[PDB]
Design a protein around this motif. Structure first.
Motif: not given
Ligand SMILES: Nc1ncnc2c1ncn2[C@@H]1O[C@H](COP(=O)(O)OP(=O)(O)OP(=O)(O)O)[C@@H](O)[C@H]1O
Ligand SMILES: Nc1ncnc2c1ncn2[C@@H]1O[C@H](COP(=O)(O)OP(=O)(O)OP(=O)(O)O)[C@@H](O)[C@H]1O
Ligand SMILES: Nc1ncnc2c1ncn2[C@@H]1O[C@H](COP(=O)(O)OP(=O)(O)OP(=O)(O)O)[C@@H](O)[C@H]1O
Ligand SMILES: [K+]
Ligand SMILES: [K+]
Ligand SMILES: [K+]
Ligand SMILES: [Mg+2]
Ligand SMILES: [Mg+2]
Ligand SMILES: [Mg+2]
Lengths: 527, 527, 527
Positions: B28-31, B49-53, B88-90
């Motif tokens: 949900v945080t991508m883009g 946070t918006k960081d995937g990891v 990390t999200t990718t």
């Protein structure tokens, strides 16, 4: 009776859950690559079906709020089935789409009633555009193509239906029965369908089909109504003495005679049935005279050479090989009437068609010729077991209904492309306010659902298929069974206009009213 | 320890449920139109946070079989973060796609090991094609564009990072700290990063950041190792008597001295730390001489004019305004060394660069000039509360890491288009058998996931966006923030090549090994 | 640690429930007709308060998802309290309004990050407009009016604070204490606040207030740092032998001396404390010389007529009647210094102010005169029991903080009218896209909340009051205590600009970041 009350978004979410469950169950059966649903039966083997309305009618939910949405979708499917006889899965998916879009657009400033008005306006415009694009059916090949498409791509059923309509006419009588062999057979039988139901439901003698059916029956006809119990008793004594069933076709039967018939049938077991006389006045006399000639009987109550009911004899009644009766209509087929009486009547009616030039007399004399000469077609469905016969019977009934619809009105492109090509018709509308615009946009987004569902059932991405369809010429559509973009009319992928417009109208009419709810009231479950 | 064993499809389905939950939370945080995740903290305010990891590391599941998949995806994200610092999200979405595709293709006749081999071959080909299409960075505008893209479209952060790299060089030291005002500030401070961590973790004086940090500290340098307790004691007596912290930079510190330093710090509260000397041989002597000149101290243990550690005096130690130390590296910034000594040493090193023509001497003399002259850049992040500062600090760290990567290697098109344009590279592969073909097709289908996820987060249908992208020219991509198809390079939507290849390699390497499992063994939960 | 994950609307609704509960509890205390909250204490009598931050800090919820919103609102209130010292209820209600408006505007096509950007832009514009409308304070009557308004309409507190600031100056030291009578008293006491905290928290001798406080203490001053244990021991032997507390004011205290002081205080019970010396270089020497003259002591470590610490005698230390110390600052009041030494110093500093014309010397000499001559004001709060004293102490602290703010910056209209009159400033903004427009409209609707809450607490319909206010001239507002529309400035209903802008900035900064969440992760409750 204590009750429970919910407000707004919670009730909407629960009802949408019910709608989604029912529509997800129904939607798996859509298209040439759809699958079947197995439904448990309490009295024997389970039922296997691909019919949308059959699946819809069998789903009841324990939760009180989901069952309301399920019931409303069931109403949509049932209305579509009773109106057109086909296209219930399309109606279900359209209704779910409209309900979801309407629920997602409800806010504090929105007025759902105006959204409903905009939805109805858009649907009316789409229906008018559909009626503009319709073209009539002129060749037997189109009939075979329609029947093949409606029968899930089965060419043999389409060929049988086309042959039946060639033999008995496009407006003839066609019946579906269980066969006793592995293959399908068509037989033509002489006989009449006189457009009259039974007088009482007590004459039904079967649990399956809701019909009254008799074999080797006597024929009793009365021009006047039956009143005296001693007028009907000697006919019942005759029908009893030969063990034969008896059919009564009289202007009416009174309460005392009907009570006597019902009591004698329930207590003793006489296979007797009473039905209303066909026609009015001279048309009634003519139908009784012609059908009596076809059955070798007499017409009682006539003014010329009057024969009374009180002195009835076995040779005054006619005979018929098989009878089928329901609440709406009845049929007598294999009558024992002498050929010379039938031929005399036929020649008299053929002369009478030339004597006077008027629509009413010509129509009635042609109807009398058609009833005396064309008969009925009976299709027997073959198979190995009852389940397969029942599934194939469902498909054959769908095909017959769709073919009758495509004879009444025209045809349009199949595969959901007809609704896709009517999307530009919504660009000519000018909404009065923002809520009508919201409704129009809901309908605009909904118009893509059937093609996407068909493509999804085929294992491909429906969005790309729809996008490519909209970018092609007007005659190009997607063949889901072959996986190619083809000319729909040349390949015979066509639908009746009536089915499409009926499904769209029913789905919109119910779903747009559903999306106006703010409070839901249900009963508290008991112990 | 009793254990539970599951076989085949059941275990696969449970692990896929865990993977799907974690990846759905992360995605949900991508883009540019992604949203944030709120994570509960036990010791105070929740983290946003918006960081995937960061999101991945915070999800542990109660079910034992779902937690295995969750842990494997966490490993993917952590490996990507430690390698590239971004993307990390990718990696998470690619790993989920590969795992799902691999699970759907397991049957009796399939050999998952060969499928893994085909997956690895396809990934290697894609990485080679990516390296072919890379182009280097030459202008500060590209640096600003990269930093702006990595900071979620924040132009001020990109401008600050570009200015910082202009002032300290593309390979200079840059640090991120919490600010105490509402706006962001860049300040340049003289100082050295000497590429050497602490001798012991016991010198850490904070719970947040895992660092040793001191202010107004004494400087002790030894050319030789410290052995005698009476050699180090008078420096600890000096550091105590002034209440000042002390930094020890020596070739090494023995067990008895380190034990004495740790015990004195733990019991008395002396702010003392010991670290390894920078350089080797003559480079070590040169670093100690230069850094002592920058701090006004002496170098102990030298052969010319030797000064002993046992007779150390306050004026023999240097002074430094702030120190930061970690397990990997340390920095001393604001030293009190006299300008005339610094200028003399600078001019000597500038002369020595002209004396001899060799790579080793030139590189080491340029490094000494850079450490004495360039200093470090410190960015302070402004905000109203701790939560916003913490979120903006995450974004700034991502931007700095991505800019460093894009300086080390080249850049490619952003928005997931770089992986889309490498799909044709898989048509040149000839698999040895059917399982390798299955793996290649899994990778081919996976290569579309990042662009589709970015488009889905923007509220549009990602399938149509990807299809339209693949039909356009090579320089055209989709601008998710504006909703238009544009020239990606002209608009500055670009990514570092290293991040993309790292994410793809890590995701494939872990997910393809995951998809080879047949039996799963877990411990039975206790009471 | 197993965790629970929720998505979208459910998590948003739970967090909004928590926010609503906390803000509903806080809001009942707002305005001249607000009421109080009773908070249970574990160690004695319950606390009765009208302070918003005190109420906010005492509410923790059992549900994990509501507690996140509660904690974020607590952060808002705490940040406002630490920044301005007043206006926490306004910040809480603004934060709730912003959070609710932001949650109601989240949809599939919305981008909450751009909504946050628009919110921040609107808040910046409003703050600039507020700074434009501010006017400075010039008369004691305005000071009394501000203090009366902040003290919940208590005129006596305002008069006492105005008299205190008249006697010690607008930038003088003012302290609040518990009284032992029924009425309030102001006393002015000679003394110095030297802007230095303690060296160690181990010197604290109370459970309430987190302070170190001593009576009849010795004074030890050192120009240089203390190192030798034998340098400090004879002062501890002197302080012990007289049973008197001892204050150490030196440039620093080392680890061994601080450890010895802490151990001797913890084991034997000597009332000893060490603090940092005030000033730097010559300013440090001057502060030590002046404060020693005010206390009758000597300055150790000086170059002219040097006195060593190792030979310290009882007559070398000064004496002070009371001492207060905290982590940030310390005060020594009633010193025993001879009048002739104080007068000599005072005259020397009065002469030095005329000798040279420079800002630095003039400022430092005026600070030395102020510390030697103005002293401190002590306010004692009267009452019958502890609860009433505690509530009145809260109100007096609020009044003092607001008066200091209104001295630092200007004043604006009270009663929430200042934010109402800044609504037209938002009509000059041109948003870049629709989401920024949504954020601007959220702020525009939020700007009415404080006045509506004040009116609602007074028992009237706030919507009509706000509507009538907006239709009146710029100087007219609503007097909630009297129920009339009056001239706000003439009636003295005024607020400090700093409090208003701080509350608005903190509330917006936290709530707009809260409204960007899509996923919430919490820990599963244990047993
Ligand atoms: N080969 C084909 N390619 C594409 N579309 C096809 C093809 N064959 C049939 N269709 C379309 O599929 C639809 C038929 O669906 P189906 O018969 O399963 O359901 P229905 O008509 O909605 O309802 P019911 O369950 O009552 O039969 C029609 O729209 C028809 O045009
Ligand atoms: N305006 C834009 N239009 C299209 N794609 C964009 C745009 N801005 C950024 N992107 C793309 O979005 C991606 C950035 O995603 P994001 O920063 O959320 O996650 P990530 O890099 O996978 O990982 P992490 O969570 O560690 O930052 C990149 O592929 C970038 O090229
Ligand atoms: N007589 C009055 N008529 C109208 N508004 C008034 C009157 N007296 C005070 N006010 C207003 O009421 C507000 C004071 O509210 P209150 O002191 O209860 O809470 P606060 O300042 O938000 O926070 P805290 O709980 O920290 O004190 C100010 O906006 C002030 O201008
Ligand atoms: K169907
Ligand atoms: K992200
Ligand atoms: K209050
Ligand atoms: Mg059909
Ligand atoms: Mg990133
Ligand atoms: Mg107040």
């Amino acid at each position: 009776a204590a009750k429970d009350v919910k407000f707004g978004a919670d009730a909407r979410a629960l009802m949408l859950q019910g709608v989604d469950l029912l529509a997800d169950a129904v939607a798996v059966t859509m298209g040439p690559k759809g699958r079947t649903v197995i439904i448990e039966q309490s009295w024997g083997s389970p039922k296997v079906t691909k019919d949308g309305v059959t699946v819809a009618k069998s789903i009841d939910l324990k939760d009180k709020y989901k069952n309301i949405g399920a019931k409303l979708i069931q109403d949509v499917a049932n209305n579509t089935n009773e109106e057109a006889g086909d296209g219930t899965t399309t109606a279900t998916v359209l209704a779910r789409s409209i309900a979801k879009e309407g629920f997602e657009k409800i806010s504090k400033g929105a007025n759902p009633v105006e959204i409903r008005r905009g939805v109805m306006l858009a649907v009316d415009a789409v229906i008018a555009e559909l009626k503009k694009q319709s073209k009539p059916v002129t060749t037997p090949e189109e009939i075979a193509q329609v029947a093949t498409i409606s029968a899930n791509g089965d060419k043999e059923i389409g060929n049988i239906i086309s042959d039946a309509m060639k033999k008995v006419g496009r407006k003839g009588v066609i019946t579906v029965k269980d066969g006793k062999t592995l293959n399908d057979e068509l037989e033509i039988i002489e006989g009449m369908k006189f457009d009259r139901g039974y007088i009482s439901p007590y004459f039904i003698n079967t649990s399956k089909g809701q019909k009254c059916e008799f074999q080797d029956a006597y024929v009793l006809l009365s021009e006047k109504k039956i009143s005296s119990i001693q007028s009907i008793v000697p006919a019942l004594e005759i029908a009893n003495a030969h063990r034969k069933p008896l059919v009564i076709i009289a202007e009416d039967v009174d309460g005392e005679a009907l009570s006597t018939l019902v009591l004698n049938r329930l207590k003793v077991g006489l296979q007797v049935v009473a039905v209303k006389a066909p026609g009015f006045g001279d048309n009634r006399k003519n139908q009784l005279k012609d059908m009596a000639i076809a059955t070798g009987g007499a017409v009682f109550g006539e003014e010329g050479l009057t024969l009374n009911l009180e002195d009835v004899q076995p040779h005054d009644l006619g005979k018929v090989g098989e009878v089928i009766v329901t609440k709406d209509d009845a049929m007598l087929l294999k009558g024992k009437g002498d050929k010379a009486q039938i031929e005399k009547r036929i020649q008299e009616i053929i002369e009478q068609l030339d004597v006077t030039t008027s629509e009413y007399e010509k129509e009635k004399l042609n109807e009398r010729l058609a009833k005396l000469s064309d008969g009925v077609a009976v299709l027997k469905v073959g198979g190995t077991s009852d389940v397969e016969v029942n599934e194939k019977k469902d498909r054959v009934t769908d095909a017959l209904n769709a073919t009758r619809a495509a004879v009444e009105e025209g045809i349009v492109l199949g595969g959901g492309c007809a609704l896709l090509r009517c999307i530009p018709a919504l660009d000519s509308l000018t909404p009065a306010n923002e809520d009508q615009k919201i409704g129009i946009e809901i309908i605009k987004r909904t118009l893509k659902i059937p093609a996407m569902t068909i493509a999804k059932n085929a294992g491909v991405e429906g969005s790309l298929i729809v996008e490519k369809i909209m970018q092609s010429s007007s005659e190009v559509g997607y063949d889901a069974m072959a996986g190619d973009f083809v000319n729909m009319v040349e390949k015979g992928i066509i639908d009746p206009t009536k089915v499409v417009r009926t499904a769209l109208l029913d789905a919109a009419g119910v779903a747009s009213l559903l999306t106006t709810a703010e409070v839901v009231v249900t009963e508290i479950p008991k112990e």
